[model samples]
Target: ASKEEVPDNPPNEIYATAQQKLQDGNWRQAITQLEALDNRYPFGPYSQQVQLDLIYAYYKNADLPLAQAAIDRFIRLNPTHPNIDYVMYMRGLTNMALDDSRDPQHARAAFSDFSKLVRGYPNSQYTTDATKRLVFLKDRLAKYEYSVAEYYTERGAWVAVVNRVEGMLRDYPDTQATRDALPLMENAYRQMQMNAQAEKVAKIIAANSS
Candidate 1:
């Protein structure tokens, strides 16, 4: 029989059915049960909890936009909820899932979101996962920045190359890309006869190395 024909009036029974569906890998049925529970008893005790579970079910079912909308609703209605990290992490995961290509914009947005989560909840259980993802996101951004620097260098735009390298040094000094690009920047500056700037960068690199 279909779940809709079960006619379970108790919210707990409905929640149990939802959980059973979720555990059985029936996300659509779980969502249906939870959504029906919400509609049948708009102010039921399990309403908010079911809504949150439904959001996760949507995510498990690979429904990105629906999951995002559910998270947005939860955040908008309960801004100060204690488990905010779950929502934040879920949102970042959804964005990352939507575009897994490591596109610059997506990487940047995911990095920002994960960074915010870390800063806001340093001791939260999600911190480790967020920190790991941030590392990958940052590496992608660093590579993108380095690619732009290389483009300028190839075109003999010495000044623009200097700008891009310096921006990377100043902003992402600890990134692997910046560490690898600093020597190239020095070489580029020397090739362009920018002796003074080349010397300055060399000294900075020396200080950092020391």
Candidate 2:
């Protein structure tokens, strides 16, 4: 018998039915069918679609880690595909969703992924959205740094706190946390008897403000 005339199987019919179910918002059915397709035709065209759909199904089901894993696999396999931006965006979105509550650790981790999206595809069509997210990530990072500086300050590690705050002001001057941190940095230096450093920072702040 020809390949087209091959005997019909339950798996083939199930796969097709699953695709229909997926279109109907029956993600559970779609996942079951896709899993069966993967097992039955590991390298077939249906299996490829199954893999792609699995990512979507997991995302829709709010299984973010599974969705992210699928995205990572797809990207690794098709790095130069035209829709790579969509893949990157989805990966970033998955991270964002996984940490929807905006826990600092989760936000920090998602920020790294957003940074990769921006840096890896600077001219990508997703640049605008990715850049916006990156700005938020930078703000969060600045806050973390300022918090650390505050810890050092409270412990009388004035020199260490000054170094951290100075670096923050130099590198992240536009961040609100950094802006609010400048005076505290000067105060720390004075508390440590570093009058010269405090004066120097004051002069720099004055010049910059002017």
Candidate 3:
């Protein structure tokens, strides 16, 4: 809804013109046209493709709420649409884009969206890219969790650090965060004076390394 002005034209023509503008890397211009489409022909022949184009343009413009709404509306209207996988994949990407350095919570949720796409459409063309995205998203979220846990480590919050590291290891077992978490847990247990728990964590680390 960050439109600069009314489209000042019919929805069909606006959509048609927007397509070209969007393809030409003119996101703001395209968004203006597409925004008019919804106001006039929100559920017509212009419905599906207009919604789809809006998603891309909104993401490009960093209009996260609009992009997300486009994806959500598209899927709800055409749950079995052939492009559902693509739509789902883009939803994850949008969330991933929004999952910047300041917001680990969104990043955590974004990883789940990516996982669903890969699992739900294992053979779809989008699945391959979704899986690739999953790896990076998991790493990003895991690193954020680990960084928080690491902060607790430096603070000598043994019990609190253990809780966070265990959660990270459980949620991100394959990530480097889990790899780093093993040692953090060991140190945490030692600080809590649970030598036996520390030794158990050490043995697991040894097994993982070997």
> Candidate 2, residues 148-176: lDDT per residue as tens digits?
88888889888888888877876567777
TM-score of each: 0.83, 0.71, 0.83
Best candidate, TM-score: 1
Q: Order of all candidates by lDDT, from best down to worst?
A: 3, 1, 2
Once fitted onto the true fold, the runs of candidate 1 whose alpha carbons sit more than 4 angstroms away are 1-8, 187-194
Candidate 3 residue spans exceeding 4 A from truth: 1-14, 101-103
Weakest lDDT window of 10 consecutive positions for candidate 1: 99-108
Give the CA lDDT, 0 to 100, for residue 42 in model 3: 68
The alpha-carbon deviation from the true structure for residue 78 of candidate 2, after best TM-score superposition, in angstroms, is 3.6
Relative to the unseen true structure, what is the C-alpha lDDT of residue 28 in candidate 2, on a scale of 0 to 100? 68
In candidate 3, what are the lDDT values of residues 79-155, reduced to their tens digit? 99988888988888887787663557777767888888888889989888888877887787788778888888989
209: Cα error in model 3, Å: 0.9
**Candidate 3 lDDT score relative to the true structure:** 0.82
- The weakest ten consecutive residues by lDDT in model 3 span 1-10
Q: If the candidates were sorted by their TM-score against the true structure, best first, what order would they fall in? A: 1, 3, 2
